[PDB]
DNA sequence: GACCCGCACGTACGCAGC
DNA sequence: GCTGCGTACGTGCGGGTC
């Protein structure tokens, strides 16, 4: 009859003291007052640990307008699949803010059975480049990644737009084209004659896998199957011949459409960047 | 009845995070007390974003301002470009390009002068702000004509293209080459070599290549050596 | 007019000594 | 040989979001 009272009184006091210590540790945080002091208890711990790590491993390799005038955001991860820091512009290119995504697992936001490559990239072996797809009623989204690895990895992120609505002034050396599912030409814009000079009557069912040169084919095959498996692609460096021989350099960022009535990938198209002028004028190869 | 599992798991995460902090500090309400103490002694971005995508900041209009070490990627000093025109620093094709591209976002390349620079930016005051960022032959069927092969085997491309390999090949060892051709036809991946000739010993490596959609092999691409 | 989750309220015990 | 600190687990009670 006497044990319960002592136990409950001591327990009540200890409960109160623990929650109060928790909240005070929460108070001093990089976040402002309003949106930090009224959060759930689970996020406080991971947010504080994330701040500690991003202020600790920052000095491991250490010694006003860089975030803006920059397309995308800066992320960073470790080998356990957990981002630490995110840039403030994250709230305009994938839809969410920093506070919910600052210590959670990338595995719970990426596409499952599309992560063995990421788990291989994150481990040790200085220069790593790859591709990665990432995010309620969440629709999936595409993404491009570059950077250097410490063990951590600091990454750059530049998503591709959709040429259905293009908010950029395409230049006079940026011609448009459309292709078919098996890398076969269908249509060329009327911007080509001044740049490299073909006629559309030849730009037809001829296979596109003929103009690439030397190792360009054995790398754009990987780029094409990357577009087949993913939604988009950004190609590194390749050429495409002209009407009188020689190579002219072009780069692309492809896309894939879907159908309101169906589920297959219907149509693909590219955007072209004329880089160098016509080269090796006289000599021909085909 | 069966929320015990979800609450057990969340308890497990709770105790793991409250228990592992000892590593991140250089040393359990005592632990939280010393940690909230430790928080009190609490341009960091350069130290990663300089290492993240290379490049350096320049501003356009003249040109008004750059980073400290721009000669790392462009090879120019700091006072030899201020008070100095960007137009009298560039190639003329890119001159017409940037004249067309002077006046929200800007995805554009350059062919700048001491170097193909992919750079992005936005307008400000008029003026501009933008970060910058930097004895063999090869042919295949032979539909394709290489570069040094016509000096190698002494034959102009007015006599080779658009014909089969063994049409002109001397069939003194056409059999072992035939056996190799059968094996490399469906081998994919890496194919090694055995001897072949023309008078001129060429030791072919072939790579079975294939459209990753139509699922039917069409072309190969050689890296023929001697 | 409610379903799922986070926080709080209950106890049945490993341990050190007078 | 038997009593207060630290601990583990079950149960309810009440706040959003569709």
Residue numbers in the entry:
A (entry chain A): 13 to 75, 89 to 150, 164 to 173, 186 to 200, 220 to 355
B (entry chain B): 75 to 101, 111 to 125, 145 to 163, 168 to 209, 243 to 253, 280 to 290, 312 to 320, 338 to 344, ...
Q: Can you list sentences taken from the study reporting this PDB entry?
A:
As a key member of the basic helix-loop-helix PER–ARNT–SIM (bHLH-PAS) family, BMAL1 exerts regulatory functions through interactions with specific partners. Using the Human Reference Interactome (HuRI), we identified hypoxia-inducible factor 2 alpha (HIF2A, also known as EPAS1), another bHLH-PAS family member, as the most abundantly expressed BMAL1 interactor in human LV (largest node in Fig. 2a). BMAL1 modulates the circadian hypoxic response by enhancing the transcriptional activity of HIF2A and stabilizing the HIF2A protein. Collectively, our study provides the structural basis of the DNA-bound BMAL1–HIF2A heterodimer, highlighting its role in regulating target genes, such as AREG, and the capability of BMAL1 in bridging diverse pathways through structural rearrangements for partner binding.
